[PDB]
């Protein structure tokens, strides 16, 4: 009852509270910095393999 209802909210601006803290320090520093490389490799490899599979399917369906 003697404390802020929403303490330490938007201290500074959007840049410091959101762009710099919630995105660079919370989303990247904690989450994306850990999985960007494996997820990117898996995603690219899956895309390439699916494209090769679809190209084989095209060759099967389409001649000439």
């Amino acid at each position: 009852s003697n404390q802020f209802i929403n303490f330490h909210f938007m201290l500074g601006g959007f840049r410091t509270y959101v762009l710099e803290r919630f995105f660079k320090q919370v989303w990247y520093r904690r989450n994306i910095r850990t999985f960007w490389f494996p997820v990117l490799i898996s995603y690219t490899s899956g895309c390439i393999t699916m494209r090769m599979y679809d190209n084989n399917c095209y060759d099967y369906f389409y001649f000439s």
Partner: protein, 245 residues
Amino acid sequence: GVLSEYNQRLSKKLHKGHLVEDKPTFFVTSSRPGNFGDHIDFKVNIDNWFDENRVHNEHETDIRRTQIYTLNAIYYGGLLSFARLYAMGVIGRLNGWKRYERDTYSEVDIGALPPGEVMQMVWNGTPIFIRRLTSNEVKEENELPSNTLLDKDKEVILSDAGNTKVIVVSAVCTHLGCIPIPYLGAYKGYVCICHGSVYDKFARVRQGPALLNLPAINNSIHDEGTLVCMEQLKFPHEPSQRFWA
């Protein structure tokens, strides 16, 4: 307003978006037990939120307590609204829904029926008695003892057309549903023979084990008895709207 508060909070000195102490801070309770001694050099606290996180309203703290209670009430009210929608769904599933009332309108011509005759008709797949009462018959029925009558709530509906009142009633015995005798010499009314239930010419319960009069049939007479509209009594059923738009 909101803009003023945002401007005030914009010029805040903090470390990488966090309001934390820039120097070590040590706090010692002056009234601690005598055996505690001095504070150790370990820096337990990095933030001074115990003091910074303060709206200095030690006077009128109950107002902030009420405000917190109000916010909790709003949150709980939203959650309870969703739960109420779910409960409506469940109970409406259990309690059926009559989307529309099926047609039951019908017409039967009673003018051909000679006065003082009872005829059975098939309406809604059920027998129904149609009768014509003369003035002498009605007068004889009136003035009779009320002791025999066993239905204070029930009444009698008499039509006015064709120069003679026409009555339409359900031809089902209230006791168990058997068809009663159509005419009796002593009283040209109804008297069930399966168990001896006795009714009068108005279908009232006179000196009979059956405790209810013959159910009445909703009807309206037009064309001077040629067009007897007969539609089952309509009862409310909600919700009635099936499409919002």
